[PDB]
Design an enzyme around this catalytic site. Structure first.
Site, short mmCIF file in Angstrom:
data_model
loop_
_atom_site.label_atom_id
_atom_site.label_comp_id
_atom_site.label_asym_id
_atom_site.label_seq_id
_atom_site.Cartn_x
_atom_site.Cartn_y
_atom_site.Cartn_z
N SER A 39 0.77 -1.40 -0.06
CA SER A 39 0.02 -0.26 0.05
C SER A 39 0.93 1.26 0.05
CB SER A 39 -0.82 -0.18 1.08
OG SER A 39 -2.13 -1.03 0.83
N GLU A 133 -5.42 -2.88 -6.55
CA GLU A 133 -5.46 -3.44 -5.35
C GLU A 133 -6.69 -4.52 -5.51
OE1 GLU A 133 -3.99 -3.74 -2.38
OE2 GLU A 133 -2.31 -2.11 -2.24
N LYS A 201 3.00 6.59 5.10
CA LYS A 201 2.38 5.71 4.43
C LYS A 201 2.73 4.21 4.42
CE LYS A 201 -1.35 4.31 2.20
NZ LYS A 201 -0.97 2.81 2.68
N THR A 202 1.77 3.31 5.35
CA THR A 202 2.13 2.04 5.68
C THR A 202 1.64 1.03 4.62
OG1 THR A 202 -0.05 1.73 6.25
CG2 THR A 202 1.40 2.44 8.00
N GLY A 203 2.26 -0.10 4.51
CA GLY A 203 1.70 -1.26 4.03
C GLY A 203 1.88 -2.63 4.52
N1 LIG Z 1 -4.14 -1.41 5.97
C1 LIG Z 1 -2.83 -2.35 6.54
C2 LIG Z 1 -1.99 -2.81 5.23
C3 LIG Z 1 -2.81 -2.82 4.06
O1 LIG Z 1 -3.64 -3.20 3.86
O2 LIG Z 1 -1.94 -2.49 3.04
C4 LIG Z 1 -3.61 -3.40 7.62
C5 LIG Z 1 -3.06 -4.62 7.23
O3 LIG Z 1 -3.40 -5.31 6.25
O4 LIG Z 1 -2.19 -5.36 8.11
C6 LIG Z 1 -2.16 -1.17 7.35
O5 LIG Z 1 -1.95 -1.13 8.71
O6 LIG Z 1 -1.42 -0.45 6.43
#
Ligand SMILES: NC(CC(=O)O)(CC(=O)O)C(=O)O
Ligand SMILES: NC(CC(=O)O)(CC(=O)O)C(=O)O
Lengths: 255, 255
Positions: A39, A133, A201-203
């Protein structure tokens, strides 16, 4: 060193690049190894949206129905008939890792090839976007589809957030959206000392990929950009956020 | 390795940092050891100058006397009786490493100590101006008077030539003066492939110090920022420009 330990301790693979933009002091650890970006490609996506539309421009009436939704739609699920404008999708993609905003936005910018060719243009020869996605998380080890490196992804983030790739206005938006993400309270943000501002921004993806990409400001000085990525060798492997938090503190300390 | 071979081939300590401003790939070697900086400071001095003065401002006539003159003023010795504009002294400073020109420019910005503070302001916590030309070159080992480092000179050069520390017209102007330096055909210039544009600013002090800093641009691709500093152990030691150029060859290959 302390990064190698964390990899044993957590049975996981880590990638780090941080850059003190004010000193060109770096912190590297597998800086060119590939991880499915997941993400985190979302920031860079809005990176190229903002590059195609004035602040004025980002109010476009854009519509979508039940079928257009995908596997996790925390914001887009409230606004079927309502409709959401680019801004608000960019907000949703960025603030809540909304999969559908990313997708709808991605169509605007013309699909993953365009994104790729745009990423090609600013100077990222590494980030390899191919898919929408959630499928984009479908990455097996050694494949390059939808992967990037820690280096590639900080640098792309820096170019958008902090270089001349974007005018003031558009750039304060990115910073802002990202400054106020809801999803990373246990990633980068938990690893910097009390009260340094953080845009991230996380993924998450298959093989236990958990990723965070950030610019972070101290009270005094120039910001550090940074990517922290990680993965594991079991497809269905689960992640520990505390991998990232920890990594970050070893970054902060080093800098 | 490669750099240490040079270090022993030429019997000199080497200071190298370089940043591919499109990938953040770097070459480093003693990147934080301190060197007497010599005339390299001349480019940062014009950086500061351009921070404070408008272009029309650069038309002002500075006069001086045969007393205002030091021990190497190749242009300023020839205009004692008519004075020179600041624009003409920048030029002479940058292209010919003209000392008096430095001393009159240094003087227009507040002297060494206002040169420190502006460099602190942009984020150069390393570079340490104290004297005017030629006494700045009188640096013994241990001393931090009039020293900086590869990471710091380079970063600083970048700030002025590429970043947001000057507007674009002033960038172009600093860059142009630096593109046409007369004094380093045998150093960074001599170490890069044909068709690579170089804007560079040599220097030489005691202990055989020989430095060169530059932005260098391949035919296609983003600019590369480049300090190569050197010193030797004996105080009356001659330098060799073959050292700085061979070292650059290593940077370009590594990069
Ligand atoms: N939304 C998430 C990861 C994603 O969907 O890319 C949660 C997860 O899937 O663990 C996140 O924390 O960024
Ligand atoms: N100005 C010098 C060195 C310096 O004083 O920093 C003169 C020389 O080469 O001897 C230069 O031309 O680079």
């Amino acid at each position: 060193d302390d990064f190698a330990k964390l990899e044993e301790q957590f049975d996981a693979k880590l990638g780090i690049f941080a850059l003190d933009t004010g000193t060109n002091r770096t912190v590297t650890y597998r800086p060119d190894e590939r991880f499915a970006f997941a993400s985190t490609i979302k920031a860079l996506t809005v990176g190229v949206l903002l590059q195609q539309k004035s602040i004025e421009d980002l109010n476009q009436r854009i519509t979508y129905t039940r079928d257009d939704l995908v596997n996790y739609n925390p914001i887009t699920e409230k606004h079927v008939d309502t409709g959401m404008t680019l801004k608000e999708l960019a907000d949703a993609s960025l603030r809540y890792s909304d999969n559908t905003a990313q997708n709808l936005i991605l169509k605007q910018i013309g699909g993953p090839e365009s994104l790729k060719k745009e990423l090609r243009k600013i100077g990222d020869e590494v980030t390899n976007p191919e898919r929408f996605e959630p499928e984009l998380n479908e990455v097996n080890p050694g494949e390059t589809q939808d992967t990037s490196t820690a280096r590639a992804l900080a640098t792309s983030l820096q170019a958008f957030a902090l270089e001349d790739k974007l005018p003031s206005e558009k750039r304060e938006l990115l910073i802002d959206w990202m400054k106020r993400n809801t999803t990373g309270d246990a990633l980068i943000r938990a690893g910097v000392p009390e009260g340094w501002e953080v845009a991230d921004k996380t993924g998450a993806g298959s093989y236990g990929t958990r990723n965070d990409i950030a610019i972070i400001w101290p009270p005094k000085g120039d910001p550090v950009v940074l990517a922290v990525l990680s993965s594991r060798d079991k497809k269905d492997a689960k992640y520990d956020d505390k991998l990232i938090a920890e990594a970050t503190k070893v970054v902060v300390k080093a800098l």
